[PDB]
């Protein structure tokens, strides 16, 4: 049994870093509206 990693496996870590950064980028845009 893998620990933690098995959940991580279906989608690559890089893709995670990307979705994180992308979300952070989306996040500020709402503030621009304010």
């Amino acid at each position: 049994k893998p620990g933690v990693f098995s959940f991580l496996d279906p989608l690559a870590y890089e893709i995670w870093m990307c979705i994180v950064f992308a979300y952070i980028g989306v996040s500020v845009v709402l503030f621009l509206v304010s």
Binding site: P10, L11, A12, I15
Partner: protein, 111 residues
């Protein structure tokens, strides 16, 4: 142009292996299938023969051996011995099993 023609069959192999699907190369059917067994087994034949042809035993004209050779040929042919030896020297000697390599392809991961 540049000409599709190539100096050697080996040259055609070199192009097709480099072609990456950009190019296709005609050649003798049995030779093609013989390449199919060969590594890296990247090659594959497609379609039926464009035209019928058949290699045959040749004898000097008027040779006494002629007819017996002929009967021997048909006899060996009907026994399936020829097909047996074909299966031998081609597929059985094959560097890459076709359905063997086909059974072996189950990966994963994510782009």
């Amino acid at each position: 142009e540049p000409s599709v023609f190539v100096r050697t069959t080996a040259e055609g192999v070199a192009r097709v292996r480099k072609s990456k699907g950009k190019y296709a190369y005609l050649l003798e059917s049995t030779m093609n299938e013989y390449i199919e067994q060969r590594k890296p087994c990247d090659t594959m034949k497609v379609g039926g023969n464009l035209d019928s042809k058949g290699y045959g035993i040749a004898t000097p004209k008027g040779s006494s051996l002629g007819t017996p050779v002929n009967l021997a040929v048909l006899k060996l042919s009907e026994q399936g011995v020829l097909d047996k030896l074909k299966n031998k020297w081609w597929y059985d000697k094959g560097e890459c099993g076709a359905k063997d390599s086909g059974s072996k392809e189950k990966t994963s991961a994510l782009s």
